Amino acid sequence: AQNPNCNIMIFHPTKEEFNDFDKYIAYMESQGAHRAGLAKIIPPKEWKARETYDNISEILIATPLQQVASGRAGVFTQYHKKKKAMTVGEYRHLANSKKYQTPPHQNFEDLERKYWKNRIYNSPIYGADISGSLFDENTKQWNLGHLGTIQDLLEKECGVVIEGVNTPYLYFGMWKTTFAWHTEDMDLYSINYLHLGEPKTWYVVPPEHGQRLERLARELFPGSSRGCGAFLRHKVALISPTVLKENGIPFNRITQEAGEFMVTFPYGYHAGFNHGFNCAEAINFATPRWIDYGKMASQCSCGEARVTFSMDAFVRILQPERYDLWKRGQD
Numbered sequence: 001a002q003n004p005n006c007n008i009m010i011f012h013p014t015k016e017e018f019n020d021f022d023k024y025i026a027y028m029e030s031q032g033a034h035r036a037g038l039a040k041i042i043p044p045k046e047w048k049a050r051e052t053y054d055n056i057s058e059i060l061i062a063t064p065l066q067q068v069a070s071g072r073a074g075v076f077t078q079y080h081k082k083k084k085a086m087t088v089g090e091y092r093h094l095a096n097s098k099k100y101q102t103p104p105h106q107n108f109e110d111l112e113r114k115y116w117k118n119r120i121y122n123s124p125i126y127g128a129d130i131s132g133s134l135f136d137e138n139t140k141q142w143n144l145g146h147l148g149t150i151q152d153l154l155e156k157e158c159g160v161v162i163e164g165v166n167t168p169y170l171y172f173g174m175w176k177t178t179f180a181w182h183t184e185d186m187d188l189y190s191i192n193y194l195h196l197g198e199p200k201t202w203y204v205v206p207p208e209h210g211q212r213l214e215r216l217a218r219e220l221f222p223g224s225s226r227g228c229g230a231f232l233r234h235k236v237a238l239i240s241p242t243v244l245k246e247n248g249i250p251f252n253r254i255t256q257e258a259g260e261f262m263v264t265f266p267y268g269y270h271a272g273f274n275h276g277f278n279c280a281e282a283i284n285f286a287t288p289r290w291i292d293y294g295k296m297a298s299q300c301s302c303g304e305a306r307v308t309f310s311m312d313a314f315v316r317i318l319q320p321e322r323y324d325l326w327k328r329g330q331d
């Protein structure tokens with residue numbers, strides 16, 4: 001078995017290997033990459049996402065989210081308070097202000113220490129989940145707006161044609177902006193490209209050990225667990241590496257820098273934080289190997305998770321027994 005310790009693997013495809021996206025994902029899996037839940041892909045030196053980032057300031061962040069924490073430093077939830085709209089230029093200025101800017105630090109490890117010590121005492125503002133793309137239309141390789149759609153994959157594998165669409169999302173971050181522990185909708189893959197700015201630190205639990213994280217989460221968030229049998233789908237709970245280690249949960253960590261891709265694999269729980277002002281683009285995707293994960297994915301039916309239009313068909317076709325309860329949660 002390849003990669004039996006479930007380490008995060010880093011790949012350096014050549015320009016020729018960067019042509020065929022599906023083929024390269026299957027290659028990475030042949031080397032055991034998926035066992036970690038997360039892989040890094042460094043593009044060939046010849047590649048670029050677009051020519052420059054000099055003209056992005058007028059993008060609108062219609063609903064910036066202030067991420068307010070509750071709990072203790074290593075075990076907390078966050079809720080998202082909606083703020084007034086602002087442009088990317090306005091948000092960048094805000095991220096760089098004395099109130100929000102990255103503190104002085106020695107290296108990524110020192111910054112990570114500072115994050116976990118101090119995150120809860122601040123409420124950073126995240127421009128998350130903005131439909132759109134920063135890839136140039138002429139970028140033919142690993143262009144996250146030109147991937148094969150999940151609806152087409154389901155139709156290719158299973159023969160059933162379904163409604164729905166699959167488009168990317170932009171994320172504008174600042175210091176301490178946080179992504180809570182989660183797997184993707186329907187335990188899909190994700191791919192995330194860090195277009196510009198400061199790094200993003202990731203934590204990940206191997207898919208084969210995801211239920212260990214779920215059992216810890218139920219212990220640490222016991223009211224939430226009584227409320228919903230899949231409350232990590234709410235995407236609000238944080239648990240620090242120190243607490244994971246104290247409880248014997250297998251995990252790994254890595255820092256993504258600008259110009260790098262990360263892929264999360266089906267049922268790979270992940271969480272993390274941004275180091276300073278940045279912009280990422282991410283989208284969900286599927287492969288043949290996903291289908292079995294999609295059929296077994298947990299679902300939130302309590303009403304909290306509320307998701308896209310296109311998840312309806314995935315539940316309806318892959319999980320018909322669960323469909324009626326899940327759809328009630330959507331309505």
Ligand SMILES: O=C(O)CNC(=O)C(=O)O
Pocket residue numbers: 171178179190191192264270280282283
């Ligand atoms: O970058 C973020 O805030 C969150 N991203 C992801 O969870 C992802 O790409 O799957």
Ligand SMILES: [Mg+2]
Pocket residue numbers: 055056057058059
């Ligand atoms: Mg602009």
Ligand code: NI
Pocket residue numbers: 182183184190264270
């Ligand atoms: Ni994710």
Ligand SMILES: [Zn+2]
Pocket residue numbers: 227228229230231233234300301302303304305
């Ligand atoms: Zn729920």
